Amino acid sequence: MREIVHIQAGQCGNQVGAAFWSTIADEHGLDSAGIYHGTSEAQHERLNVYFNEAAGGKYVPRAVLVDLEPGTMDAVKSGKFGNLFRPDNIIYGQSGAGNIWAKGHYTEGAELADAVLDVVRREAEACDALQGFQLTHSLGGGTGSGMGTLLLSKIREEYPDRMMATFSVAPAPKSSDTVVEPYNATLSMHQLVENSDETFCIDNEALSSIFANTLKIKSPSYDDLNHLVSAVMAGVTTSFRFPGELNSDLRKLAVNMVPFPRHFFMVGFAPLAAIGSSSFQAVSVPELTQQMFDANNMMVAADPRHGRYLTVAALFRGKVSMKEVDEQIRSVQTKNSAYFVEWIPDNVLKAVCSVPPKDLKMSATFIGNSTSIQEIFRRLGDQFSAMFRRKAFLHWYTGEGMDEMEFTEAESNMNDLVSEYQQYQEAG
Amino acid sequence: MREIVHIQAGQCGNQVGAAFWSTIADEHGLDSAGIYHGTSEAQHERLNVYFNEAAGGKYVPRAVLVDLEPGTMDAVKSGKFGNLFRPDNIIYGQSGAGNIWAKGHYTEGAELADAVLDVVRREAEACDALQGFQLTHSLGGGTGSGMGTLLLSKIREEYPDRMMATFSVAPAPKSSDTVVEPYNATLSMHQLVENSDETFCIDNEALSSIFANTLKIKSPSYDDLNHLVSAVMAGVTTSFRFPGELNSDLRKLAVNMVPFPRHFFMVGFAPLAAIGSSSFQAVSVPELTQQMFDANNMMVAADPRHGRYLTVAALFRGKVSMKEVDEQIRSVQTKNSAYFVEWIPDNVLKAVCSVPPKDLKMSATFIGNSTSIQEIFRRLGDQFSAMFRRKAFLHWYTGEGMDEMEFTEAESNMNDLVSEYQQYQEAG
Amino acid sequence: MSESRQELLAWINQVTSLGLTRIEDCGKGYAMIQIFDSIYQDIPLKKVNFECNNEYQYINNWKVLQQVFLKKGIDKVVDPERLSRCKMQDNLEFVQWAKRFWDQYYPGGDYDALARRGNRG
Amino acid sequence: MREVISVHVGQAGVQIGNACWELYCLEHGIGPDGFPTELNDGFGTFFSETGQGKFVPRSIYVDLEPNVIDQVRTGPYKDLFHPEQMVTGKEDASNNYARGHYTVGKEMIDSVLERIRRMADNCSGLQGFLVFHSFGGGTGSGLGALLLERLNMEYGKKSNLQFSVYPAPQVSTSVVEPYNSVLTTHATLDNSDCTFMVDNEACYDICRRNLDIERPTYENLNRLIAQVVSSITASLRFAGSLNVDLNEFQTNLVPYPRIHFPLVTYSPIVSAAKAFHESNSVQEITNQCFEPYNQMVKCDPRTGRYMATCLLYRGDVIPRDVQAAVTSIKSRRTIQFVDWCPTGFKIGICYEPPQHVPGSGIAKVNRAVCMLSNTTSIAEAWSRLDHKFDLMYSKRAFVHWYVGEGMEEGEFSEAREDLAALERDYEEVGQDSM
Amino acid sequence: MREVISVHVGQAGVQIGNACWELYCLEHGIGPDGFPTELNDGFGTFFSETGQGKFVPRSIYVDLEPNVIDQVRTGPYKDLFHPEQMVTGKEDASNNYARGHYTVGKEMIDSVLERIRRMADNCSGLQGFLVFHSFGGGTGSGLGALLLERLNMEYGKKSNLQFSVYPAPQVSTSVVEPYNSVLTTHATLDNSDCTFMVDNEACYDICRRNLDIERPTYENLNRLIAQVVSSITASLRFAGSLNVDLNEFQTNLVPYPRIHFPLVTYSPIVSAAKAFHESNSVQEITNQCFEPYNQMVKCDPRTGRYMATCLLYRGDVIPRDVQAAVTSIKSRRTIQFVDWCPTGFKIGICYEPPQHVPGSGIAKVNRAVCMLSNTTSIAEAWSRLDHKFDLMYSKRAFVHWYVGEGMEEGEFSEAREDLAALERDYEEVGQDSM
Ligand SMILES: Nc1nc2c(ncn2[C@@H]2O[C@H](COP(=O)(O)OP(=O)(O)OP(=O)(O)O)[C@@H](O)[C@H]2O)c(=O)[nH]1
Ligand SMILES: Nc1nc2c(ncn2[C@@H]2O[C@H](COP(=O)(O)OP(=O)(O)OP(=O)(O)O)[C@@H](O)[C@H]2O)c(=O)[nH]1
Ligand SMILES: Nc1nc2c(ncn2[C@@H]2O[C@H](COP(=O)(O)OP(=O)(O)O)[C@@H](O)[C@H]2O)c(=O)[nH]1
Numbered sequence A, B: 001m002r003e004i005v006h007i008q009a010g011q012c013g014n015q016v017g018a019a020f021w022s023t024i025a026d027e028h029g030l031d032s033a034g035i036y037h038g039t040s041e042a043q044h045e046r047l048n049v050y051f052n053e054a055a056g057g058k059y060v061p062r063a064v065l066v067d068l069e070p071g072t073m074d075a076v077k078s079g080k081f082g083n084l085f086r087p088d089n090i091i092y093g094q095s096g097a098g099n100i101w102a103k104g105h106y107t108e109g110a111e112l113a114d115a116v117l118d119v120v121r122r123e124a125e126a127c128d129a130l131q132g133f134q135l136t137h138s139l140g141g142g143t144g145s146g147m148g149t150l151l152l153s154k155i156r157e158e159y160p161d162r163m164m165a166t167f168s169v170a171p172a173p174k175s176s177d178t179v180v181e182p183y184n185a186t187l188s189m190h191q192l193v194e195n196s197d198e199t200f201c202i203d204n205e206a207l208s209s210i211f212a213n214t215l216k217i218k219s220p221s222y223d224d225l226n227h228l229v230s231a232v233m234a235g236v237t238t239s240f241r242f243p244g245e246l247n248s249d250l251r252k253l254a255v256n257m258v259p260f261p262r263h264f265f266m267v268g269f270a271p272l273a274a275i276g277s278s279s280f281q282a283v284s285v286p287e288l289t290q291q292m293f294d295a296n297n298m299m300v301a302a303d304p305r306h307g308r309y310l311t312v313a314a315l316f317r318g319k320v321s322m323k324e325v326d327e328q329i330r331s332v333q334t335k336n337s338a339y340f341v342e343w344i345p346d347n348v349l350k351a352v353c354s355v356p357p358k359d360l361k362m363s364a365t366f367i368g369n370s371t372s373i374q375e376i377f378r379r380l381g382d383q384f385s386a387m388f389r390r391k392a393f394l395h396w397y398t399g400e401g402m403d404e405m406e407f408t409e410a411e412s413n414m415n416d417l418v419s420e421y422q423q424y425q426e427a428g
Numbered sequence C: 001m002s003e004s005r006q007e008l009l010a011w012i013n014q015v016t017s018l019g020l021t022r023i024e025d026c027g028k029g030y031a032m033i034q035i036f037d038s039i040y041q042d043i044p045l046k047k048v049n050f051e052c053n054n055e056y057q058y059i060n061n062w063k064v065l066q067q068v069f070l071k072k073g074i075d076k077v078v079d080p081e082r083l084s085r086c087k088m089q090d091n092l093e094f095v096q097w098a099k100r101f102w103d104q105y106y107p108g109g110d111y112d113a114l115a116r117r118g119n120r121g
Numbered sequence D, E: 001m002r003e004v005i006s007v008h009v010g011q012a013g014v015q016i017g018n019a020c021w022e023l024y025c026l027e028h029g030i031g032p033d034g035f036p037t038e039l040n041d042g043f044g045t046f047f048s049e050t051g052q053g054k055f056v057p058r059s060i061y062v063d064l065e066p067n068v069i070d071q072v073r074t075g076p077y078k079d080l081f082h083p084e085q086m087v088t089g090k091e092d093a094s095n096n097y098a099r100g101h102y103t104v105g106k107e108m109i110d111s112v113l114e115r116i117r118r119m120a121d122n123c124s125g126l127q128g129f130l131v132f133h134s135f136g137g138g139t140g141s142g143l144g145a146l147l148l149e150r151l152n153m154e155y156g157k158k159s160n161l162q163f164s165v166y167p168a169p170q171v172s173t174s175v176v177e178p179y180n181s182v183l184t185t186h187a188t189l190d191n192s193d194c195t196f197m198v199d200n201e202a203c204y205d206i207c208r209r210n211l212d213i214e215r216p217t218y219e220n221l222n223r224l225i226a227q228v229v230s231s232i233t234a235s236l237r238f239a240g241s242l243n244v245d246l247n248e249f250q251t252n253l254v255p256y257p258r259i260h261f262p263l264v265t266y267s268p269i270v271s272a273a274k275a276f277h278e279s280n281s282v283q284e285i286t287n288q289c290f291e292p293y294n295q296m297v298k299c300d301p302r303t304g305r306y307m308a309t310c311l312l313y314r315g316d317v318i319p320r321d322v323q324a325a326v327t328s329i330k331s332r333r334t335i336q337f338v339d340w341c342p343t344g345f346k347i348g349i350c351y352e353p354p355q356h357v358p359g360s361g362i363a364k365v366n367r368a369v370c371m372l373s374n375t376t377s378i379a380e381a382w383s384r385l386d387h388k389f390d391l392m393y394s395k396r397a398f399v400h401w402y403v404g405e406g407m408e409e410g411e412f413s414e415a416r417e418d419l420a421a422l423e424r425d426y427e428e429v430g431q432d433s434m
């Protein structure tokens, strides 16, 4: 019944579970205890996606929370929601990853990979029909950046028809975590592009701009940060997980987007407001569409005004027509006609879902494609290569088992990406 | 009425009684005092198997607990359940066995064999119709390994139609008891193969893996160890001892298994979980079947992935269909088709029993055959022969009455077994 | 300084002449003991088994080196139990370490252990 | 369970731990008798517990005097340790490297190396081990350099951190501090993974201004170094926000295997009346941690350019006030450049508030910062030594009392030579072109 | 009822039992007057009870002095024995084998052999009998070797265990310990089924470190040997988990009828303050029982390879912590090989907790280990004797006082010869090839 098995990796790659799973329970009317409490009968017919049925209504979240160090793993165990996940799927090593890629990709995950795949296999064939797999991790760290990629390439070597879809979070332009965060980003992209289809890129610093610019809070914390970018994992399945009028799926959101095997694009929300900014509007699709236009409601630290929109899919939920979107999309595609790609007339995808979220009459989820995602990788590439000139921190990788020229290959892998996005910025 | 008289031998060969007999009473609704307390009327029509009827409802367990030293014999006497067995069948010598085989097989049991057979004869002809005899003992020790075998060969020389079925426990690959445990194992197999039909092999170390790997207890004791492997003695008679839909018997479980007179195969349970791992599942036949696949739910310290399945019998109890097993056995026989033996298409035996056990909605008992039970005996044989090169500890056997070349014969007896399992590993 | 998998695998394919697909067969071995016979020449090859994919049985084959390290005296502890897992985190820095032994002790000549063990018979 | 053990050699290494473990016992609710308690994993972090409930501080003590060690069993921690772990020496010839190394200190080693062994036989999750000594010591410089060179010979890949203390630019404690200190950076060069060093006269300089006490003592300097320890170690012993492992430092501080001498900067260190009439926000602290007033080592980190620096924050911290602060440091002229890392930071967040010991005059605070700064200037105290040490060796002053204890002067011939490559290494990193 | 009797010859054999039976009376709730009690079979194990409720310790005492024996009737156990069993000798010429064997000690034998007889006339389940003597004794070495050779001549197949004690590598108690000790291993070679021997100077070496008492005595050494006795005997007198018989040892320690000299290793032996600040788990003990610090016999069992070793555990023991420990010993380099048994162990479990006598400075523990280790090294104290004894015989020193008591030197001609085959036997087992 078109279902997904969930995979996390890394510390903050595991932190996103609670913003995900407590929402998707609340989106499906489900408590902390797992037992059922839902209002409408609308929220059942596609409930089977992110949940395996249980004895006595428990409705276990199909997930495997994976990490290399037991620091933050007990935190969601010993905290609340300690009875949602089944601890057979909680696995974690003890020795530190040191957030070094090949330590996390090549060798210490290989201590734990043998326990990984026997977990997800018996999860896979107990499902009816897999729709796909989700990988949420980091680009910057080591555990999520390294171990999930080796974890990915085995799964893509087992299920070549099944779709592989990934979420990940970006290195920052300014607010970076560590100094090998250039190396981890390049090495992560070497496996994402080759194995999985689609990956999205979320700057924490641009996420920090959101509550700064839009919601006006001087001091949010990460439990507000993941709480916001949670709902796009809700939003991509919003179309899917309960009925509507039109909606399609992530594989149908895969083939429509890109004319090539080269899949990266953007994320945004609609609507969005502050505390006191709530009631002073008229929340509607013209209110929705303009928070689906700015870079300020995006996640990528790159300018669509520097870029060009390849393809757009829009995912609405609530009482919403088409012509309220039609007349409004036409109102903004005309003034911004040079912002579209002339390879495709009408690269707009419309999808209308039924029920609203909590306390909001409408909601929309943004998917727009760009040429300026190279503005990440050009900002990455010279951030990468300048730390290769003196072979910066090289012995913490070649002192673990990887040839240095294998690291040089991923540069051209990044440059193979940019070489295409060099063209469709200005060609045709 | 198709009934069994029970025989134990050795210290831990007598320890298994309490895990057996308190369960089979509880499986038949029967107290410590022997007098009847049962809920359903379902548990009577085949109650006569492991019990001789008594005056005043006492329902004596038909058993003879046999040992050479009075250390552990009083322990179940002076402990609880001291009024189940009748003390006429409690026999035990006083002088130590020293756990040396021919001391226990050939000579000190011959002090007690004359009292043995006059016990089991009057037990035999007081039964209606014997279904068979159970021998539970050790391979490693002396009393259970030696005295029961001489005890066996007299019974097989008295009742050639009656089936002889034995349970025994293996030498360990790593966690061995004594150093003559190689000699006792070889000498025990010289009588098991020649006289009785079937014997099963249970590693304590692989049993120690079960609570380690599956149930997650750092420190179980033997009263948890025998408590687990008890229920397969319940499980082999689960089909038999109260009604169902289809079930067959151990003689019908004998002729179906092996195409030769060479009878050894494996043991496992289903389901199985930890303390907190209980309610987080959906206990069913797909939950049952996958704990009927791994080596981790087996007992033998040998790889079925190194081996090949000759024949399989499955013994379910609970509300269970066939197609829930059919579609599921077909789901695993296809992915693991090279794991089966191509001499026989569909070597699967299905048997469905009715009532569930205590606090579990379903239960299954594993019987699967292997080629890699030679992985015991090859691990035994070079463990055997290397302690023959210098005639290791030889005077504690030839100083008791057995010729040394008689000990050499059992090597080829082991090698006669392996010579066949050499073939059907890769032939045909 | 250190060596990756890329050079070292054909490097250990060289001096042993073995069909070593992945390094985790040194999780069993068969090559680490074939490092030392390229110097010391006294190692009794008939003391190890050859097929032996049976980890509970394999533990005999780790200790055969503990006579070799005895008679020549290199004080590194060998903990075979995670070594025998055919898993990494110990086997690399056991063979990164045995090519720290590559430094001075070669006489340069070849040592055909492919011909010495009876053509692995 | 991600556990690590701390050795204590040298009379400095004695009294340093007497502040470190005091902080350790207060940072878990441990009664001073060992029998505690007048997080979940936290209650068994540095401590191999017995079922009695008291527990052993996983440490060791190494000294060749019975003098200062037996003060502990006189002192109030008489039940904390155990009298196997606390190995003394009956006699001593300290300020004498090459008999504390080569004659008298070596007789303790086989007794020492056994006690390293069994404490490594319970700590299943082992993260290397921690080393305390001094340069102003003889034997702590002496046995300490000998202590690493067999342990890293044994333990191979395991982590080797040490917090050292070197003789000041202005005030010595002994004349041998050219001699029997500057050679010990030989053995600790290729046996210490990373290392850290600090000045008394710089730490005293903080005491007259930021602590404002005219006559401090060692103990107050001991308490100040000790929180830097728990800022690194116990941060992974507490469930923070962005956790920082011990292994992360040694891969986020060295581009090259030699260059492992960062700074220490700890802040806020604020006196009693100074905390009042003052709000110390997080950027109020980080603007102090680049100013030389809270600087631990009497050097010129202003003049040199910074290389790479990890930061550790305690208490109630947001990353937005980090990025609002740290974007102002990189803008400001008071740093100019890194060439080899266009970011040059590592940020780490733990929630545990700064522990405030009652006795000393330090004041309580609700947020904390620890700073480990690599620079292009820290080799000048090394160049102070080269100005000093090459002058003593320009007279051959008790070479006999380096010879008669059993070592020729070939290592003194090697002494400035390895030092010369250290000076050569910072100008090598000082090369910043195309 | 699976019962056995313990003879006591020699002044060592006097005072050894004065710790053994003290432990025996405390391990069953026996008042010191014999009239007890201020398991089921346990209450009548070593004891042929009378209906009065007091009971005889099934022992005997053999000495040719009235000196130390009459200390018992002066001492507090004056009602324990009975004055038939306690057979003395009116005169003595000790340190003189061949009149304690052949002249003066033989006059007691017919009185002794009767008292062996009637005590064998109640013990229906007889498991051989137990022998205590010394090598440092004359007559205990003298009459003791004579004691076995008629009893094993009588009793044939019956079990013959002895706990001996031999003159140290460094400290003798008499000069005759080359002479009137090393010959007694003739008669006890082919009359003792198994045997065991222990060193004072090794047991004293434990006292200065693991007991930490500067001036111990015999009595403390007597208490330490005594628990090894009850670790073997009373383990079958208590309903354990995997019971171990007396007969199991003599078939699980010798591949060949000569090689019956194992080790003893008892652990934990832990002083008073040492038990505190310490958790001694079971693998914490077994990692000590292979280290030479708890080693009973001053030899080099590290260098030699181990042959076969049975272990006995007391108290609260799981076999999983056995197999987690014992798989680490066989991995570890500190043993290398057995060739003749690829397992080389025998594991045995009894539940009875370790008995803790009040007076001495030993500390209480909730788990115990006894170790009986056969090796390829224990013949070196025998080779110490061959270095010693062949030198005395290279001068013929009071051969007259071996002759004048009534024996020619043909046994001294045989003395090193049987010793030479013992040395030849360990290199014979030292042969490990194809
Ligand atoms: N105890 C102590 N020593 C300090 C402190 N600060 C700096 N030191 C230095 O530590 C050195 C202590 O070692 P020593 O003076 O040699 O005393 P010691 O017992 O002989 O030390 P060893 O040489 O290692 O035996 C002194 O030279 C001081 O310079 C401190 O706060 N406490
Ligand atoms: N009584 C006693 N003797 C010990 C003890 N430990 C060692 N010994 C030795 O036991 C020997 C005692 O026997 P003797 O010295 O000859 O005293 P004795 O009465 O003449 O003994 P016999 O020769 O058998 O008559 C001494 O040589 C000591 O070496 C102990 O703890 N108690
Ligand atoms: N999703 C998410 N990522 C974060 C947050 N805070 C920091 N990060 C990034 O997540 C990673 C945290 O590092 P870590 O999880 O330890 O890397 P790991 O080795 O893969 O576990 C770093 O790359 C941070 O830049 C957060 O709140 N949410």
Ligand SMILES: Nc1nc2c(ncn2[C@@H]2O[C@H](COP(=O)(O)OP(=O)(O)O)[C@@H](O)[C@H]2O)c(=O)[nH]1
Binding pocket: B009, B010, B011, B012, B013, B015, B016, B097, B098, B099, B100, B104, B138, B139, B140, B141, B142, B143, B144, B145, B146, B169, B176, B177, B204, B222, B223, B225, B226, E242
């Ligand atoms: N069934 C069983 N066997 C055990 C257990 N513990 C040890 N064993 C084995 O059982 C035998 C115990 O020896 P023992 O019973 O005295 O041998 P016996 O001479 O035949 O009585 C040994 O071979 C042990 O390996 C247990 O808990 N259950």
